Assembly symmetry: C2
Homo-oligomer: 328 residues x 2
């Protein structure tokens, strides 16, 4: 029945690590007076979540600037000039304005042609995979030759405000404990050039994927159990559409909320943890950029060889779950 | 005679259902001008820049507690009724509004939750200023044409309460400058409303309108011309007009090539509107007959990406559209972008 994409490729990919380190030891030294004025005595970031550091941008780097930097590096990786780009999609959570699209600002920075379509997709942590699928569909129909999918994430403001609130004399302990999860966010950026396969015949192939949703929960631990339920449904669809079995996939590129979230996931599906690269420990949760930043690292480290079957997945707020395949 | 390709236009994609919601509270330009009068006086403004220059006499607002997702949901339930289908048939739900409940999760996921979509339903938001509904329609059409889904919903709820409240405060300050007043005045041409469309594979709805898609051009060097956040919009009206017309000329050339358009053969032009004199300039530039151009701007203002489907819905409910009518969907959006697409009723 179902036909996958047969002429969609990944011509180039890149990531940008943000340059300022904020360690969890440092955050905890700033929060110590509060932690004690509440007899909190676990290191929740470092010991439970498993986040030892995250990166922050320079002052007033906007999402668009970070996404621009990643795009230029991706265009170098693909060996193509901006004038070949027919579609630029931005998929970040961080956005400069409500309007215009962050994509238009990125596109303007790069000097895209008057034929270049641009718009933003928002879907919490799954939006990069949504953008890749969007772009795939246009490539397949012959609308464009090349597409850029870009994502810049900024968390500088969220840290400033969250740590300012938490250290206030009024702050309660009910506050603290959800205010803490904002402290797992990290900065970073990624970009991908996709292309029609006849232009880049040796490049990795994007096959497509599946999505399942549980939007009864659009409003922590329940959500770890409910995300796993939804991922199980999604794997079943992936079996039927993609011909998946766990044992044959070479890498699982996942979205990363926490160490215990990842460990539950790998345990529930019987996946070899060695096939699951994580960067949360040093970068935190980089939202929808996490998946392409991990794939880019896998690439840059020489971990991917021709014919490797790569799963790209996550569980994102909604709840939604998407799983897609690349053949390297 | 000569075999020709489709020009990448969409095949066997239809509009199964369409609806709009008009926001309930009227805010007249007369009241707005009474609040602004002391500032008009101080800045020496003697013309009615809203009612007489922009051509907006009223706009609608929601109550302060209505979110984008709530408006969109209302319009989605009505479009499902129009398509005579239940929410279980929907495989894709895309939200296209400028207004948004949260940075995350998407507004689409909220609407989808409200409506009770199936676990098979794919949902996400698209953002592209006033063109996003068309982008949404195209994304859904790609899936429908390929046969991956049977039905899609594209939804858009716009809320302008906050921008009105905060703009009116700012523009009534005894200290506001002429330049700031001018920068923010276009905010007082926005309106509230909502629209939703059900798209389907044509096999399932053989008498329904067909959506062909169309063309897009951009001028992203002009991306600073109009910028908005939750409570403020700053716009260079003058350059938006000039650069928008230029862009639209380029995009009409493409439309001739791809859609076969000549202005005189179209039956209706559904045009996104920013002001009466920008609309007059656009219709005069391109030789369009003004009787083929429905306007709701005077009483509802500029509803952003919802404007085009709201006008299409009102044309449907007026009985203005007959089978075989060729309807052009046109807009210039902040970016700058320009899209032109065709519906065959």
């Amino acid at each position: 029945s179902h036909m996958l994409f047969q002429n969609v490729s990944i011509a180039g990919l890149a990531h940008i690590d943000a340059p300022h380190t904020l360690t969890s030891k440092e955050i905890n030294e700033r929060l110590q007076p509060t932690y004690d004025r509440l007899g909190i005595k676990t290191d929740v970031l470092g010991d439970v979540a498993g986040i030892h550091a995250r990166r922050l941008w320079d002052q007033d780097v906007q999402a668009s600037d970070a996404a621009t930097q990643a795009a230029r590096k991706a265009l170098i990786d693909a060996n193509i000039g901006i004038e070949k780009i027919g579609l630029l999609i931005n998929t970040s959570v961080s956005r400069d304005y409500l309007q215009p699209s962050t994509a238009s600002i990125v596109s303007g920075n790069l000097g895209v042609s008057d034929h270049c379509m641009t718009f933003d997709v928002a879907n919490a942590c799954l939006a990069f995979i949504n953008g890749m699928d969007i772009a795939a569909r246009m490539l397949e129909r012959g609308e464009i030759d090349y597409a850029l999918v870009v994502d810049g994430e900024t968390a500088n403001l969220v840290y400033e405000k969250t740590l300012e609130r938490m250290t206030s004399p009024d702050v309660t302990e009910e506050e603290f404990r959800n205010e803490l999860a904002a402290l797992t966010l990290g900065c970073g950026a990624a970009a991908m050039v996709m292309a029609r396969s006849e232009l880049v015949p040796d490049a990795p192939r994007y096959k497509g994927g599946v999505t399942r949703s549980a939007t009864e929960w659009n409003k922590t631990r329940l959500l770890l159990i409910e995300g796993i339920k939804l991922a199980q449904k999604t794997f079943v669809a992936a079996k039927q559409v993609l011909g998946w079995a766990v044992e044959e996939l070479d890498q699982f590129v996942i979205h990363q909320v926490s160490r215990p979230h990842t460990a539950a996931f790998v345990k529930s599906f019987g996946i070899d943890p060695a096939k699951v690269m994580t960067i949360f420990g040093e970068h935190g949760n980089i939202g929808p950029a996490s998946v392409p930043i991990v794939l880019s690292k896998l690439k840059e480290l020489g971990r991917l060889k021709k014919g490797d079957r790569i799963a790209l997945l996550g569980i994102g707020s909604g709840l939604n779950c998407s799983m897609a395949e690349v053949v390297w």
